[PDB]
């Protein structure tokens, strides 16, 4: 939410992307394609596994404790026993509620951040050869076949190769 | 013509609802449960040593009520008391029952060493029709009911040093007679007094003659007390009547041992965390099964579900 | 020429200071108080049932001190004891006063059923000049002071079964005489003994003859004890003298009831949360009025103010 | 703070904007105007109401408890009673302090984020017809009357209509 | 040709590892320790008033055991009891030893005012070979062992009003004789009874004759009790034998005072926070030295280190 | 991490920058230079000192408490004493662990944010005279001597002075 990509300038997610969390869709001369980005996907996943490592399978051994149910009315010492247990349980119940609320807010934010970082990285890569349409798509102003698209996804795209073609197309009348 | 390149993210048809700081309901692609809320209903017999009390309380096994003879010298990580349990010996009470139960449960052993106390001038091994063992009048196996020898009960002044490495736990009692006859028959005289002392402690107890409502046809009572004797120190028993004497001592240990009230069956299975409702998995950090737990357990919380998001916000087509 | 388009945000002339993780003082456009720090000074009589003790402690109303006759059989969600309260009957003490107060307060009722105990061979309804009711020598309404009949006080052995669904609470006592004369006049003999027993309990109490500093001209004392009797079980009172007997039992309930010491007046108003200083609103999650609370209340914290920002950082022109 | 708009590249807030939290000021041929943006304003407000829903009116019923003042010196059991209450109060006092510090830091950050998202959204919308002056204002390089400005605020501005005019003005000598 | 302008951030050759929400090991440029884990091993004598008990427990200094005569009327913020401490007077016990220790430690003073009790008809200042003071048979300095005058011990009925602003604390005792001779020699009669009363309290205590294991050649015991008397109220001592009477009262204060068991030496140094292991710095918010603390101290946690990052993520060349 | 600059589009830090946390490296006609930015450096440092002010030297006075070790087996009341202390210690141990994890995540994020804000601020300042190479460096398309660079660092760079030179160089063939 806090970065503005997921449920923001990206209108919706893609149900047909099942091999990654983030990726690329394109239209060119050779057709309409989809490929997942592994690095952004793994970066989000590693962070979420980070939180899980701290929460799953981390329990604390306790043995002899106080009594916590009673068959007899006894007064003062039993009031104290009950009160201590009730106090404890509210404090942990509070910790659990807060914990999940903050972690969930952070997970939503870091997943939105990875989307944004992928978008920005791709924008810089394209230099003057493309324009941001504002909905997470770039209009690329040169012929860009499947090898060319592939090169943008793998981080090997050389903007100098197409720059002349692109400026001619962009600053046309 | 050129090309269009769209950046994006996945989504799923079936999202789940989680809570956040700013929103009590937001749909994410995936989540996992942090509150364990179910048991199989069985107490797993591994990897903790479980002693099923069956018909016996811990205290009945301690004293040596005849139906608990099988518990002699047993150890446990966790002692499980059943609600069907009942006593079947001489009626008794324990001032601070809860503390004796607790310190024995925590010690985690019923190991008992016999000692030879110099009881000259009294009759040992008094029994009752209230405490049947092997179809014969008997008594608590760890206790020694002293009565008169030739219609005389002289003053007792018996001693027992602790030369061991450990604390000894002595369990003993006082017979409160129901009537005049219940005092005359066993001690053939008017009144008793018991003073159990050490270098650092003294407890003194007067029998009170008086009718109590009958329990297993008996209007008398036994009152049970205890005494811990340190290394170097000495037990001293001083009695003019009504002493229910110890036959020796229990070892008192420190460790991880405890006790739990539960009617759940014991199963052939392996689980680290026990509750009275049965064992529970301990993958999750929180649980709402029971505030009473033993072992490596999730912490008890009031909430029945807490979903942790493990995926981005779900924004379907 | 073209145009200029500036993006921006609001601001206010009067900002407020809040704390953050990185800065103890930052100005935001708006904030709200999370700590409740004031009361009206009144205890609201709704929606909880408030019983104003006025001149009476809970225990004085329990025993039946004459100025507390109006409390008979009353219930309460919250019992309010006033600091001006005082006793005006026979001087007395309660071993574990605090526990008796607590368990009665928690039960939340003074409902009393009379029972007909077989007191043959003693005189009932003993009174004193220390406990005036309607200008006549009287006693605690729930207690029955037994004395001699024809200069003889025989051994009492009275029984009363609990055939009800609920626990019965029996309140009783022992007269400790100030002098020899205070023992001879009422019981016309040397010493008493009281043994109150059940199937599961026994309390035994010896009167101790001896002068105490006078309270309402009386050097004797009454000591008050209590006994709970379960369904199926039976009360047994055994006495040779000095028994302040019960006239019946109190119902003991479980529920939300309690007690609070407070000198705040009761008002005609509706508030869910009560403190000794008066009722407080419960919109806020925290409060610094009093650690003592009853009802749906904010949690007590040491801080007197905590501002939550409800607006952006304020950056004025 | 963490996004750099409020108390960052935007020099100050506007006291004369009283109908929204975020908005637009413009100078054109027809004069100098101000209008609040409702969507960004509501997005921030909904999140803050989010926090308030979790904090206001959510209290916990407690009834019979332990005693917490004493007229008598009693020793051991009274020490324990006092210590339990003192322990409890410090833990809640800690929870309250931390809670407000984190929420306040988050509120400041999410309000800064909404400013930033509005700015970025407007930048993309303008395409090549405007330049970012670095103080949250855009220089628009074409004639842009009140209908045109209105169209940028409502998200209906078509950059193609003015693009020729704008490139001619931008890349002049 | 033009120019290249690179934006960047620093780094260091030697980073440190910290924990985060998403990663248990991330390298930052710098961090600081939040858990204090060491002491110098000394208890600093400033700025708190430290009273080193040396060979004396608080209770021995209270009663007035002869080797503790130097403690008379001393005050303390913190009383330090040493494990080498031992008693060297008449053997004794205290029912609720822990509570008496605690309330005296908390009061923080041994200030004692003598009072002149009307002990007519008994012999004062009884002594023993078990309690040597200045090479002569003596007794506890604050206690007054009353014996017979001309082979008669009449009933005592002595009174003492509290007309002060403060609560008075009275310390007193009962002699439990070892044998018949230990009762006849001092009181020249069969049995004692002690009833210490106020307007609001009564304690009554019976001596129990009986041999205890010898401690400093003595098979008798003294049992120590206490009584608090409010302003307006009156102490009453009623005794027919075996009274170990008070010579006056102790002031009881409220304040910041306490007691700590420790074998650490006292040093000439200034530290706000004391543990049994020695004083510790209190810059850090947490500590893992000891759960037992006195003063302005970091809170005790189970962790031995917690690193707070004070720099950005380290990403070296 | 969450902004994408530190350990993101900036490949690594600079060990030879010892006078600030953030700064500028340049190549021009007059050579290759380095200067730290004081404002971004101080902004990060003030926030971290912010956290330290709340954590260092803030301790709580406690005096008479309960007993916490025991030489005697006593049962019920001792169980309660131990249980209360054990309960307390786990709750504080939890608070300390969570606190450090959140603060550390926030410190990493705010330091990354300051990097990003400096970068963005510099980008806006350059207007059309430079392009973002995607690795935190700008290619400046005009002659830019040490005074010119100095002017970009001090926030006094006037883009209009060089704009003609720069567009000619950028949109060359
Ligand atoms: C929604 O989000 C959750 C959390 O990220 C995902 O659930 C996890 O999914 C993975 C993989 O499917 C699970 O991993 C498996 O764990 C097994 C152990 O499971 C038990 O023990 C754990 C405690 O550690 C409990 O949480 C759990 O309930 C079980 O009782 C391993 O044995 C599995 O290993 C298998 O593969 C490896 C090969 O790498 C082999 O070595 C093994 O022999 C074995 O064949 C496996 O690692 C994990 O348990 C789940 N975690 C939780 C917390 O639930 C969901 O997948 C995700 N949903 C979707 C649709 O993506
Ligand atoms: C600074 O920030 C705070 C918090 O966001 C704002 O304060 C809130 O302001 C709103 C609107 O002015 C208040 O809403 C009103 O609440 C009434 C109930 O108030 C009582 O009960 C609540 C507990 O729920 C207490 O917090 C409060 O102290 C009161 O005791 C409603 O009855 C009102 O409803 C009115 O309008 C509706 C129409 O929609 C009608 O249905 C009603 O009949 C009625 O006429 C109203 O909703 C709210 O109480 C404030 N909250 C808090 C927590 O204080 C400030 O407005 C803001 N300051 C500025 C300058 O913007
Ligand atoms: C890694 O990160 C940490 C935390 O940011 C840095 O450690 C701090 O460094 C500063 C400066 O070097 C230290 O400041 C000094 O504090 C002295 C007091 O120290 C004692 O008391 C504090 C409690 O307040 C304890 O934390 C500490 O352990 C000591 O027991 C002052 O007296 C010093 O003042 C000096 O300079 C001023 C001039 O401005 C003079 O007025 C003084 O007379 C004196 O000469 C000084 O302020 C600070 O103590 C450190 N804090 C912590 C928490 O450790 C590291 O510097 C940093 N590492 C790197 C490599 O950058
Ligand atoms: C109808 C009725 O109950 N009448 C009672 C009658 O029961 C009672 O005699 C006693 O009865 C009980 C059964 O309830 C036992 O039979 C008692 O005998 C024993 C016992 O088994 O308890 C025998 C045993 O050998 C004795 N052991 C020793 C060591 O002395 C004990 C022991 O003396 C007593 O239990 C001590 O309390 O008793 C039997 O005495 C008579 C007795 O007055 O009263 C009728 O009213
Ligand atoms: C100057 C002085 O005090 N002299 C006392 C003298 O008071 C005391 O006699 C007793 O005085 C009190 C008043 O303080 C009462 O008048 C006692 O009478 C009653 C009572 O009201 O308490 C009468 C009542 O009917 C009795 N009730 C029963 C059931 O027996 C009670 C009861 O016996 C006693 O209260 C028990 O403690 O007493 C009156 O006895 C004499 C007596 O020795 O001593 C002078 O020194
Ligand atoms: C071998 C052996 O122990 N035989 C004992 C013999 O010790 C014992 O006599 C008593 O011995 C102790 C020493 O252990 C003291 O000497 C006792 O004398 C004193 C005392 O110092 O304790 C004298 C003192 O003046 C007395 N003080 C008062 C106020 O009366 C006290 C006091 O009476 C008693 O301590 C009370 O318990 O005693 C000495 O009595 C004899 C006595 O029966 O028994 C042998 O078997
Ligand atoms: C005191 O009263 C009880 C109750 O009536 C008497 O106990 C009963 O005695 C009969 C015959 O001995 C038994 O069958 C009952 O089971 C007893 N009932 C209970 C409840 O105990 C008791 O005998 C009386 N005591 C004296 C000494 O007379
Ligand atoms: C024991 O001492 C007390 C205190 O002197 C005596 O009680 C006083 O007795 C007189 C006259 O009987 C009363 O007027 C006083 O009010 C009493 N004062 C107090 C404080 O109780 C008491 O009588 C003495 N007891 C015996 C048995 O002689
Ligand atoms: C009761 O038994 C104890 C233990 O034997 C007796 O105390 C011993 O008495 C001798 C000689 O008088 C002393 O030397 C020992 O030191 C005592 N030992 C202990 C452990 O106390 C005691 O005398 C006996 N009591 C009676 C009254 O006969
Ligand atoms: C990009 O990467 C994929 C392998 O992941 C490969 O199939 C494709 O041909 C690559 N294209 C280029 C232009 O590098
Ligand atoms: C337990 O008691 C029940 C009911 O009296 C009986 O059927 C069962 O056999 C007893 N078991 C043991 C082990 O004593
Ligand atoms: C203790 O035993 C001794 C010696 O047999 C005797 O003198 C004394 O009266 C006894 N006391 C008690 C309370 O049993
Ligand atoms: C476990 O047993 C307790 C008995 O008090 C019961 O209240 C509780 O609901 C049970 N919980 C589950 C999850 O079975
Ligand atoms: C309460 O006591 C005071 C003072 O003795 C008296 O004036 C008032 O009338 C009493 N009220 C009741 C209800 O007994
Ligand atoms: C109890 O009452 C019975 C029967 O009247 C009697 O034999 C016995 O002595 C009484 N005991 C006490 C302690 O009152
Ligand atoms: C409430 O009453 C208590 C009495 O102990 C007092 O200390 C406290 O200051 C009062 N608080 C307010 C807010 O009136
Ligand atoms: C934009 O929206 C407002 C209504 O909110 C309207 O008055 C204005 O004319 C609209 N202009 C255009 C160009 O859509
Ligand atoms: C403390 O006791 C020891 C060992 O008996 C002795 O050497 C030392 O002098 C004593 N100190 C004091 C102050 O009594
Ligand atoms: C209390 O002292 C009085 C008067 O000397 C006497 O009558 C009474 O018996 C004494 N009682 C006790 C228990 O000492
Ligand atoms: C402090 O003393 C205690 C004694 O129980 C010991 O267990 C602990 O390890 C000591 N800690 C340090 C840091 O010296
Ligand atoms: C920029 O600032 C530095 C002083 O910090 C100065 O030496 C340099 O000459 C300045 N240059 C310009 C062009 O302002």
Author numbering:
A (entry chain B), D (entry chain B), F (entry chain B): 1 to 173
B (entry chain A), C (entry chain A), E (entry chain A): 9 to 325
Task: Please give sentences taken from the publication describing this entry.
Crystal structures of Bris07 L194 and P194 in complex with avian receptor analog 3’SLNLN (NeuAcα2-3Galβ1-4GlcNAcβ1-3Galβ1-4GlcNAc) and human receptor analog 6’SLNLN (NeuAcα2-6Galβ1-4GlcNAcβ1-3Galβ1-4GlcNAc) were determined at 1.75 to 2.3 Å resolutions with 100-fold molar excess of ligand. The 3’SLNLN adopts a typical trans conformation in complex with Bris07 P194, but the 190-helix is slightly lower and the 220-loop shifted such that the RBS is more compact compared to the apo form. The electron density for 3’SLNLN in Bris07 P194 allowed us to model three monosaccharide moieties (Sia-1, Gal-2, and GlcNAc-3), whereas that in Bris07 L194 only permitted us to barely model Sia-1. Taken together, these results suggest that the binding affinity against the avian receptor is increased, albeit not dramatically, in the presence of L194P substitution, which is consistent with its role in egg adaption. The elevated mobility as assessed by conformational dynamics in the 190-helix of Bris07 P194 apo form appears to be diminished in the receptor-bound forms, as suggested by normalized B-value analysis. This implies that L194P substitution increases the entropic cost of receptor binding, which in turn may explain the generally low avidity against sialylated glycans. At the same time, the L194P substitution results in lowering of 190-helix such that a hydrogen bond can be formed between D190 and Sia-1. This additional favorable interaction may help alleviate the entropic cost during receptor binding. Secondly, there may be a high surface density of sialylated glycans in eggs, as suggested by the fact that eggs can support a wild-type-level growth of an RBS mutant Y98F that has a low receptor-binding affinity and is attenuated in vivo. These observations, along with the results from our study, indicate that a slight increase in binding towards avian receptors is sufficient to improve replication efficiency of human H3N2 viruses in eggs.
